[PDB]
Design a protein around this ligand. Structure first.
Ligand code: 2PG
Ligand code: 2PG
Ligand code: MG
Ligand code: MG
Lengths: 426, 437
């Protein structure tokens, strides 16, 4: 039985409060931290005198005073994650988890999952593999590393949000990490040399954000850095456009200079096609806005690369079903706190796998020292993880955790490599 | 009886390899990760790097990891030392290395075993690490939670820009608790970040190695005005003080005995280079104008004359970092010459927990303050949080409230604070003397 459930406020990587939950069982303490339009509703305090309104005292209170005591009295076996998460949603009673807070619910859900793994005597990724029905051997994910940032994070005209390197040709996860780390060091030096010493400072996810004007300008910098590291042809490129940030819905046009020409979705698709034929771009996330379903489907029809829903799908089985039915995208960016329980997150992955989607387990821009998503990526056999540049330990702690899993599993794990889109069946 | 000692390579917060060590006992797995500095002093214990320029730009730690797995690990298991006898362990680790600067097996190889064994020793006692370190250091109860010195504006070798001084810190010492001090600093930091973007552009909001904003500014006066304005916007003027880590060894021109406040720009202007007297005048002017309560490395690592000259006139905290390199022999010299009145304690500058504790005890003996410190290359490891509490130092330096290699330490003290309740007190305004609080 659970002997203790207790939450507290801790700080995420941006300096904002977030929820940490302890679940104590006979196997010890099991801890999880929650990261930070159609997303599950996180509960913030809204006291403008406290953390600028971003406190989580009410969500922590909901764990300590409401969820905790109820779950203990309900006396659910901690291995039965589905039953735990069903009970959590029953307690909340709202579709968007706005009664108790999605951050309150997820914190309990993730901490109980670790208690369940411990009860089974297996690490969390093995437990998640059981919960998700993924086969052996385990698949280690290709890291999609956001080394250069634009859009809302940068000061140049560059509208696209994230430029990533993809070390998919490496024989092992460990070698892929070394490759990406070496490329990143080259890029940081290039950014400082070509744009000034201030260009080496990093944004929220550990990448640089110089004053870049065009997408080709950013891709050439990455291309140059891959070459200096000696990995041209061994490392691919991915993008997170976050096009919702510059979609003018009234005119159905996209503003590539939204921080200072506007493109229809057909013209923006032409630009992606031109970039994808010139650069080794194997994955594009949110190329069109979160409700611009016609644009996604138009783009899906012609594209042989990965098309990742983020704001489009918000880890939400209802939005995934729509995207499957309308053939809008072929991969899911899985953010557990967008849906708010581990079971619903696993279902979202399962629903994506059923349509032969790739699944890229993802961090949030506000991360913590928590490494749960590393185990989630391995347990889901997703073969892809998006958890930042190789910089800032809220990003690297996830990578370090996969290094530990890699070493622990030895031959019972294989690197997804170039098959990351289909790694669940690799 | 240790059942297993195993090291691996992991990545620190700058993306460089470092050593992580597992020690497995009856109580389970105990793990520690070694940090890595950027503005490293010449006298620090020797960090063993691979130097293979085709791998991590030469910064691999495979050789250090091998030393743990092949040499240190098996020798420590066979020696069968009780894991809670930290002194005997660190005595044995140093005997194995046999050199003064730990250049044989590597200070990063040695420290990882030292800290992982320390967590094993704490667990055999059934107490948290901070309580075990309090036993080892002989520090009294109740526990003292440290004032977080928060480097919210980065300069020097930690960030890109024209700012010579390395670190500008806020010091929430008036707060009634550690938890409230953290909220105050977090609120100031958010005001500062928005203010830096407004006055210097969106790029000024990007952060340096330790999570502080790095606006392209020239003088310390500009950095201090920005922090002052942020403190006022957050409503904490008079409640939060300011500290600096000049890291002046980075811009000391040793041959001419001058200090270059524009060392980032090849624009020499050697007439703008300052003698230590002129640099001391600058510190005095800043300390009389701003609420500066602590200045770290105001003069170079072997400019003992400058330190002593400054110490004589200064009532604020003067912190040795590169001067003392957490080294009892250098601390003795600084005591004898009256060079500084506080130790910046970096465990990986000396390479074992026991020597680090000795460095703190030697400092306390001269009524020094002790500020437990991160390195600029940090990890998800939180050991220094338990060290700061265990040593009753009352001050910690572990970053801006930004980037989780910094916040993980602060979060760990939040957990200690909640765990201890009334059995702990916030050092507050008495951080310089917290060991005797
Ligand atoms: O857009 C994304 O993929 C991530 C950031 O990488 O989302 P968020 O910023 O909302 O956490
Ligand atoms: O100079 C310092 O005080 C430290 C921590 O801020 O930096 P580094 O680890 O690079 O020496
Ligand atoms: Mg996105
Ligand atoms: Mg220093």
């Amino acid at each position: 039985p659970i002997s203790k459930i207790h939450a507290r406020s801790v700080y995420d990587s941006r300096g904002n409060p977030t929820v940490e939950v302890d679940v104590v069982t006979e196997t010890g303490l099991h801890r999880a931290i929650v990261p930070s339009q159609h997303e599950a509703h996180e509960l913030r305090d809204g006291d403008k005198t406290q953390w600028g309104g971003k406190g989580v005292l009410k969500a922590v209170k909901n764990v300590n005073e409401t969820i905790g005591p109820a779950l203990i009295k309900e006396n659910i076996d901690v291995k039965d994650q589905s039953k735990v998460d069903e009970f959590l949603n029953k307690l909340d009673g709202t579709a968007n988890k706005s009664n108790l807070g999605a951050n309150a619910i997820l914190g309990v859900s993730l901490a109980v999952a670790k208690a369940g793994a411990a009860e089974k005597g297996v690490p969390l990724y093995a437990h998640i593999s059981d919960l998700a029905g993924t086969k052996k051997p385990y698949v280690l994910p290709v890291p999609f590393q956001n080394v250069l940032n634009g859009g809302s994070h940068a000061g140049g005209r560059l509208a696209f949000q994230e430029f990533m390197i993809v070390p998919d040709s490496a024989p092992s996860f460990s070698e892929a990490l070394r490759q990406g780390a070496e490329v990143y060091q080259k890029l940081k030096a290039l950014a400082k040399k070509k744009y000034g010493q201030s260009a080496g400072n990093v944004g929220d996810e550990g990448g640089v954000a110089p004053d870049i004007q065009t997408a080709e300008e950013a891709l050439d910098l990455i291309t140059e850095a891959i070459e200096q590291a000696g990995y041209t042809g061994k490392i691919k490129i991915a993008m997170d456009v976050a096009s919702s940030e510059f979609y003018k819905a009234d005119v159905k046009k996209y503003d590539l200079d939204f921080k200072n020409k506007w493109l229809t979705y057909e013209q923006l698709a032409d630009l992606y096609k031109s970039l994808a034929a010139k650069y080794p771009i194997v994955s594009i996330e949110d190329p069109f806005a979160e409700d611009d379903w016609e644009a996604w489907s138009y783009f899906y029809k012609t594209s042989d690369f990965q098309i990742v829903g983020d704001d489009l799908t918000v880890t939400n089985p209802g939005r995934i079903k729509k995207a499957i039915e309308l053939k809008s995208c072929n991969a899911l960016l899985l953010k557990v706190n967008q849906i708010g329980t581990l079971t619903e997150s696993i279902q979202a992955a399962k629903d994506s796998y059923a349509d032969n989607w790739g699944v890229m387990v993802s961090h949030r821009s506000g991360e913590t020292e928590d490494v749960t998503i590393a185990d989630i990526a391995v347990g889901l056999r997703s073969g892809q993880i998006k958890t930042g540049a190789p910089c800032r330990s809220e990003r690297l702690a996830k990578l370090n955790q996969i290094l530990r899993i890699e070493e622990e599993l030895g031959e019972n794990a294989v690197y997804a490599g170039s098959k990351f889109r289909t790694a669940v069946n690799l």
